[PDB]
DNA sequence: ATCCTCCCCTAC
DNA sequence: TAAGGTAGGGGAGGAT
């Protein structure tokens, strides 16, 4: 019991063992690598000449499904179909990593705090909190990916995350529904009780939207030609890939608060969209609302090996950071370089460029944030440097990192988060 | 134009 | 209390 503090040599070990976000990142990097290792001698890229169907396949409320299947006996009482269930560490300002669809019927969402969620429950409804079972998440994910491989359906299986894969069938010069059904069935068995939904389309963007539409335990087909207003009407603006909270808020401020993708598509003009959200992103949204992928998104089909090749490496710690003096900070920075250099040597790379980035308490923010041990409201400060030669040397790297911290000049007592980055990685 | 640094955003 | 990580697209503004 009793959490290891940031000035302890084993902070990172203990914090990473508990952070579900760190697992998500680690599992993602490992799946990319596993992809590169398995396809060393496989000719891999899709062409413009190629005709293809995307099957975007994703576990439903993963984590809540798997924590529930693996639950301890003191929750046998529990019932996935009727009870609101979440997976989380605590009881107040503690993130809900995953909630089941009964929880979502009350308005509860994945990154919400437990205290916020319990306000949403009417009288006589009790939130059930399950613990994380990281090993088990990983076992179901393995069963998933081996099951996909074993059916011999796809020309290519792109790992996007621990519970999600984009699968491509190449069609030379009805079936699709049976294939959806087989995949959902075989994954449900190979996994034991877990459910997957499937979006199937001729675009990556439509497949992702079809997936959302399918989503409690179903599949949904939807091609560029099946687009209708009743389809677009069913999606929030941030159901678009690449649109999240800031873009939502900009889209709303520009197009008088459109409430569904349908309302947006009827109101927007390419020009105003670009001026609003960026251009690129605006361009992406534009193409999306016609069912089409932007060029950036497509690189993953036209060259998976490149897109999936890791181009940088870092840690980023924004919880539990509390220091009194620079000695503690320097030692921490040194430990973080030690950790990172073990990773760098494991992937047989060196670095030519480094960044130290930090979160500093805003002038106006309480010294102790509402979230226990949290970073609270902060400003970002970042500085990078080019190394003369690519190296994996501790002395070069740790010294420049401690040097970069002095240049940003954050008093230790104000530090609330810190990131150490190797931008630019050089082979061999 | 283009490139570089310091961010912001999104994903999951 | 509680574990707010991390890769990588992208833009603004200065430097060339
Ligand atoms: N803010 C978030 C979002 C997700 N994850 C974790 C837990 C989720 O179970 C898993 C996969 O994330 P998804 O976005 O796919 O969401 P779910 O699988 O939970 O729900 P859905 O049925 O909407 O796919 O990643 C998390 O910890 N915090
Ligand atoms: Mg999911
Ligand atoms: Mg997912």
């Amino acid at each position: 019991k009793r959490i290891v503090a940031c000035d302890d040599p084993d902070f990172l070990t203990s914090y990473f063992a508990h952070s579900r976000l760190h697992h998500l990142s680690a599992w993602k990097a490992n799946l990319k690598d596993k992809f590169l290792n398995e396809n060393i001698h496989k000719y891999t890229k899709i062409t413009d000449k190629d005709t293809y169907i995307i099957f975007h396949i994703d576990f439903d409320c993963f984590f809540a499904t798997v924590a529930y299947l693996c639950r301890s006996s003191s929750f046998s009482a529990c019932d996935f179909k009727r009870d609101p269930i979440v997976v989380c560490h605590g009881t107040k300002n503690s993130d809900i990593a995953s909630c089941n669809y009964v929880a979502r019927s009350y308005g509860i969402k994945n990154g919400m705090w437990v205290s916020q969620a319990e306000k949403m429950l009417p009288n006589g409804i009790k939130l059930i909190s399950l613990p994380y079972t990281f090993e088990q998440f990983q076992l179901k994910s393995e069963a998933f990916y081996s099951t996909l491989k074993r059916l011999n359906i796809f020309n290519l299986i792109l790992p996007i995350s621990i519970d999600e894969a984009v699968c491509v069938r190449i069609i030379p010069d009805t079936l699709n529904a049976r294939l959806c059904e087989e995949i959902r069935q075989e994954i449900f068995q190979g996994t034991n009780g877990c459910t997957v939904s499937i979006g199937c389309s001729d675009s990556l963007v439509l497949a992702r939207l079809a997936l959302k539409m399918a989503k409690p335990n179903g599949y949904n087909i939807t091609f560029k030609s099946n687009l209708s207003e009743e389809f677009w009407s069913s999606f929030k603006l941030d159901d678009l890939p690449g649109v999240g909270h800031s873009t939502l808020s900009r889209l709303e401020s520009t197009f008088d608060s459109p409430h569904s993708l349908n309302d947006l598509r009827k109101r927007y003009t390419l020009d105003a969209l670009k001026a609003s959200v960026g251009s690129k992103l605006g361009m992406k949204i534009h193409l999306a609302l016609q069912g089409q992928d932007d060029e950036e998104s497509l690189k993953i089909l036209y060259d998976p090996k490149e897109v999936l090749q890791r181009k940088s490496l870092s840690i980023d710690i924004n919880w539990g950071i509390r220091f009194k003096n620079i000695t503690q900070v320097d030692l921490f920075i040194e430990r973080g370089c030690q950790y990172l250099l073990e990773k760098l040597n494991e992937i047989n790379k060196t670095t030519s460029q480094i960044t130290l980035k930090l979160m500093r308490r805003c002038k106006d923010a309480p010294i102790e944030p509402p979230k226990y041990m949290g970073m609270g409201r902060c400003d970002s400060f970042s500085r990078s440097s080019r190394l003369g030669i690519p190296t994996n040397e501790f002395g070069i790297i740790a010294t420049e990192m401690k040097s970069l911290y002095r240049t940003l000049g954050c008093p230790p007592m104000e530090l609330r988060g810190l990131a150490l980055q190797f931008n630019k990685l050089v082979d061999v």
Side-chain angles (χ1 to χ4, degrees), chain A residues 314-327:
Chain A
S314 77
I315 55 161
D316 216 315
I317 310 291
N318 300 280
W319 191 75
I321 263 47
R322 306 281 143 100
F323 293 110
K324 304 159 171 204
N325 63 235
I326 11 103
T327 295

Side-chain angles (χ1 to χ4, degrees), chain A residues 58-62 163-164 215:
Chain A
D58 175 288
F59 282 73
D60 315 313
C61 48
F62 182 57
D163 74 332
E164 159 170 21
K215 212 83 167 79

